[PDB]
């Protein structure tokens with residue numbers, strides 16, 4: 001598809017730190033530290049976090065919006081799957097899903113006007 005890549009990517013950049021300002025606890029800023037949680041990789045197939053998303057974006061791994069949205073969702077779904085319901089992590093994830101949802105809804109509308 002033909003849409004101009006460069007405007008799409010700055011859209012993704014802007015969107016990404018809009019997602020990140022919703023994560024006020026900085027819980028999802030960086031990969032889940034295998035240092036503090038050795039078992040994290042046991043049941044979680046594909047880890048994800050905002051810095052890895054930043055890396056993927058700049059490495060041109062996001063060529064459409066749906067893959068960007070899929071990687072955001074992984075962050076939420078990974079966290080709900082690993083942590084028990086009565087954790088700081090789980091509850092902050094519940095709240096990220098709702099608030100991130102709103103951010104993405106608006107960014108998707110803007111991406112759809114491009115191609």
Ligand SMILES: COc1cc(C#N)ccc1S(=O)(=O)Nc1ccc2c(c1)cc(C)c(=O)n2C
Nearest residue numbers: 025026027028032033036037079082083088089
């Ligand atoms: C930014 O790091 C932290 C932030 C807070 C707060 N508020 C508490 C501890 C750490 S920690 O780095 O000490 N440990 C840690 C352990 C498990 C984790 C995570 C972070 C992060 C996620 C998203 C996850 O799902 N899990 C299972």
